[PDB]
Swiss-Prot record:
This is Serine/threonine-protein kinase Sgk1. GO terms for cellular component: cytoplasm; cytosol; endoplasmic reticulum membrane; mitochondrion; nuclear speck; nucleoplasm; nucleus; plasma membrane. It comes from the Eukaryota. The chain holds residues 81 to 378 of 431 of the full protein. One of its GO terms (molecular function) is protein serine/threonine kinase activity. It is found in: Cytoplasm; Nucleus; Endoplasmic reticulum membrane; Cell membrane. ATP binds at residues 24-32, 47. The modification Phosphothreonine is found at residues 163, 276. It comes from Homo sapiens (Human).
Length: 285
């Protein structure tokens, strides 16, 4: 009954190695807990998924902007995954406190997310459902995305939706049409994150969920005149409804990488964290 977890697997690790403090959060499946390793005396985030949710399950990818996986293990009923505890706060918590970001700062976060997505696509992996709840900052103020390689397609999601005030997600037109997830959905999500970073609300927003779905599919893009033309151009490109016309359809990350909005970004410097972040979270750990 032992599930194959991959190279990260730990035959020696048991739950009794961990002090479990509180519930950190919940994605689309399972739960995440704050845990202090009894012996090691350090803090981790342990995702715990129940075996009665699986209908190669884990394919971890290392990258400077993807949350690090330390090891994984299992019991009779549950699977456990030990991750870095990221204490710089959720990106959108900082956005909340500020209403919106200036473009240079928004650009920096968008660039880090873009590089991780572009890296993932090169290894033939698609993010699928990038959401604000997935976007954290580390102690230094660099972006950390919470996906660590779990196969979403093989795990049963818990996803009903409310008519008013749903879970914050960026559903692309093609996702609503329930068409295969490909690399161009990730670019729609990038554009939506960038849109929200600039305007303080997701694009096509409505209090009513159905209205929002309606707006995503049928309402033309609304770009108020408070951003530079390069920002406008990028958002017009990334938030195309037709994914065959969308920025990234023909050359993927190279189209975003070479876009005028990111002209001031040295992509080698960024990926290697040589650019001092535009904001320092008021903590260290
Ligand atoms: O798949 C998922 O739902 C998932 C997988 C990993 C995480 C996660 C890994 N490390 C973390 N560190 C901190 C926090 C955190 C701390 C305070 C407030 C909110 C989040 C979350 C994580 C989260 C979700």
């Amino acid at each position: 009954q032992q599930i194959n977890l991959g190279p990260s697997s730990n035959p020696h690790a048991k739950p009794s190695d961990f002090h479990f403090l509180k519930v950190i959060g919940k994605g689309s499946f399972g739960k995440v807990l704050l845990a202090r390793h009894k012996a090691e005396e350090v803090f981790y985030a342990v995702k715990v998924l129940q075996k009665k949710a699986i209908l190669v399950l884990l394919k971890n990818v290392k990258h400077p902007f993807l949350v690090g996986l330390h090891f994984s293990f299992q019991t009779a009923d549950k699977l456990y995954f030990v991750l870095d505890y990221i204490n710089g706060g959720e990106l959108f918590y900082h956005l909340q406190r500020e209403r919106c970001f200036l473009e240079p700062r928004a650009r920096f976060y968008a660039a880090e997310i873009a590089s991780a997505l572009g890296y993932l696509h090169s290894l033939n992996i698609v993010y699928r459902d990038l959401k604000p709840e997935n976007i954290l900052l580390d102690s230094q103020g660099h972006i950390v995305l919470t996906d660590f390689g779990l196969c979403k397609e093989n795990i049963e999601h818990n996803s009903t939706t409310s008519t008013f005030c749903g879970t914050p997600e960026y559903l692309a037109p093609e996702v609503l049409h329930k068409q295969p997830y490909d690399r161009t959905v990730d670019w729609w999500c990038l554009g939506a994150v960038l849109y929200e970073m600039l305007y303080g609300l997701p694009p096509f927003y409505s209090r009513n969920t159905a209205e929002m779905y309606d707006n995503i599919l049928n309402k033309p893009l609304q770009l108020k005149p408070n951003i530079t033309n390069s920002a406008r151009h990028l958002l017009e490109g990334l938030l195309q409804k037709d994914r065959t016309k969308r920025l990234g359809a023909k050359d993927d990350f190279m189209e975003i990488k070479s876009h005028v909005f990111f002209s001031l970004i040295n992509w080698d410097d960024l990926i290697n964290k040589k650019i001092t972040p535009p904001f320092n979270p008021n903590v260290s750990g």
